Amino acid sequence: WNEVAVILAATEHDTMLEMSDMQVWDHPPIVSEEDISGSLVPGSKSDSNASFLRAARAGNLDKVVEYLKGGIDINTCNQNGLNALHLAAKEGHVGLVQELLGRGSSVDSATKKGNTALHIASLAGQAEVVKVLVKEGANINAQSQNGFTPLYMAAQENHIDVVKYLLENGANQSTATEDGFTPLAVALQQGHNQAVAILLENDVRLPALHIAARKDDTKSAALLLQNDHNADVQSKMMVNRTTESGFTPLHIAAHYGNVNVATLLLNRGAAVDFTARNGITPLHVASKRGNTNMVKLLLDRGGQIDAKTRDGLTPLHCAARSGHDQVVELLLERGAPLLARTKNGLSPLHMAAQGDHVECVKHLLQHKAPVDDVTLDYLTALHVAAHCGHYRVTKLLLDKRANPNARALNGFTPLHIACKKNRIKVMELLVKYGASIQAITESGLTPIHVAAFMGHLNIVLLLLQNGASPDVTNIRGETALHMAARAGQVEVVRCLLRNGALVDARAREEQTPLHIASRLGKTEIVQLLLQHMAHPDAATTNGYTPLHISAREGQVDVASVLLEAGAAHSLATKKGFTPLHVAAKYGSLDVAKLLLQRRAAADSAGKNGLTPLHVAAHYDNQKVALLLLEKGASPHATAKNGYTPLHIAAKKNQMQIASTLLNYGAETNIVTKQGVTPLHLASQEGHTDMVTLLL
């Protein structure tokens, strides 16, 4: 059958995803001001509209009004949609803006990017242009493209007076962008304490607190937490309110190692062990990221040193997996459970070995961890270091007296595993430290079995050069050559044959590798085995030679290489069947033709007296029966039953095959030993069209 189920990554996947969900997702956007070209190209108003816009940017109200009287539409814009009022408002020309307003320019005209004149002036920091526009009736809460407001633009660039003015005129602090950010958010993102203090001075607060947790802004964090009261329910407090990802401010500060803002939050009542997602605590985040002092503060403030995620990761697990040997040492000195286990039984040592972190293994074994502590499937840390090909941790583990022959759950030894994953470095190292070259699993696979079946040619080479006999058998009786042929690894088969492998080794059913190569159609491997003195007439227990198998499975090319190599063309099995009988049994038509072209007897007979025509008559094989009749098979031959193939076709209701038989001169008035004719069988079985077709 299949040997793939007989021969750990899906085990690693779950805790790997639970350590992947310890990430924090996001910065507020920054506005970029518009670009101005001034080119003439923009129907005879081209050079005039263009020179007019140039005059508006340069700030010359003389040539601008003189141009306006020359009959140029005031709502004239360039490629991007910029008005004379936009160009004037960006540059602080207060007079040009006043005259442009009186001359008839619209206040709330927006470019292609949706910025009104008030937008442009706010981002640029023209306090007086803003005063003119606000007093003239401009929409102070105008949302540009993506929803930015002038208050947002001023707060982003720390234009303080613009912010004080827009707040005095009543600008909405709450109006957020398309993704949810307010002026306070970007003011915190840029590090403008002045702005932040001003916007917080009059009347939103929570996402600002999360940004302050990322930014280590203790000033703004202390400012945001003055209206929140130390209630008896920590969940209601603003210091413990979460993002959309379930993370609290303390979780975030733990992610960025921000010790100061974390101390502030904890002093304002931030709860130290609030879980997010599948049980992730701030200790888990700080530990995964290696933030040593964050871990120190969290433990000092009553953090659970042994808290488990859903699958069982403790903070020491996370720190060990990530190679944060300082957090590992701190956690260990504070008394972390050295042998806490995940749901599949992994110790922190298994994680540290899984990430090739030598220093974490050194500190873990220093604190008396058992070097051969096993998982639930009995995988030592050396097993994991071998599965990952990590050379350094394998060297250290072996140097600290880890057993290189440790048997795993299925009998697998670190050498077996390093051989299944093609780790030449780790395999050679394990052998140096005493791994048994020819140790077997519970299913009897040596390392050369595993490497040969998996096609790792260099490993097969190294094992063969180290003294691995390729003729060790598994519980199915198969040597490395059998499985190397079952999987189709041609180069490995050549390497085994060239290095003394038995060509015709017998397994269960006394079958050689040639039988398996014929069953699976491995044509090139049939060639390779035959070339190395494989007897092509080798028979199994039921009597099949490789020719019989090609006749059963329909492999025509294999039958070709076999017959050209001298395979006996009409050999008997236990039931006395020749390859032609088998071809007539399984409908292999081409193999039957190729068989007959090679001097195969058209009507060979077994112990029972049957001919391939009888067989084809039984199994309702029309084309092969026809090919036999054409090649010279008699339809009047009998068996031990006195049966012609016409009796057989008559009993089992073979309409077409009996048609071919009668058309080829099949005797109808033929009797058996017990006085039976095909009319008696045809009538007894209950076939109408049959008995009709006889007469």
Residue numbers in the entry: 1582 to 1588, 1601 to 1618, 1622 to 1638, 2026 to 2186, 2191 to 2682
Provide the authors' own sentences about this structure as they appear in the paper.
Although AnkB and G do not contain AnkR_CT like sequences in their tails, more thorough sequence analysis revealed that both AnkB and G contain a 13-residue segment (denoted as ‘AI-a’ for the AutoInhibition segment-a) that share a similar sequence pattern with the last 13-residue fragment of AnkR_CT and several MBD ‘site-1’ binding targets such as Na+ and K+-channels. As an alternative approach, we replaced the corresponding sequence of AnkR_CT with that of AnkB_AI-a and produced an AnkR/B_CT Chimera. Isothermal titration calorimetry (ITC) experiments detected a strong interaction between this chimera peptide and AnkB_MBD, with a Kd value comparable to that of AnkR_CT with AnkB_MBD. This chimera peptide was fused to the N-terminus of AnkB_MBD for crystallization trials as we have demonstrated for AnkR_CT. With this strategy, we successfully obtained crystals of the AnkR/B_CT Chimera/AnkB_repeats_R1-20 fusion protein, and the crystals were diffracted up to 3.3 Å. The structure of the fusion protein was determined by the molecular replacement method using the AnkB_repeats_R1-24 structure as the model. Consistent with the biochemical analysis, the structure showed that the AnkB_AI-a segment binds to ‘site-1’ of AnkB_MBD (repeats_R1-5) using essentially the same binding mode as we observed in the AnkR_CT/AnkB_MBD and Nav1.2_ABD/AnkB_R1-9 complex structures. In particular, Glu1630 from AnkB_AI-a occupies the identical position as Glu1622 in AnkR or Glu1112 in Nav1.2 on AnkB_R1-5, by forming strong hydrogen bonds with Thr94 and Asn98 in the R2-R3 finger loop. Additionally, hydrophobic interactions between ‘PPIV’ from AI-a and hydrophobic residues from R3-R5 also contribute to the binding.
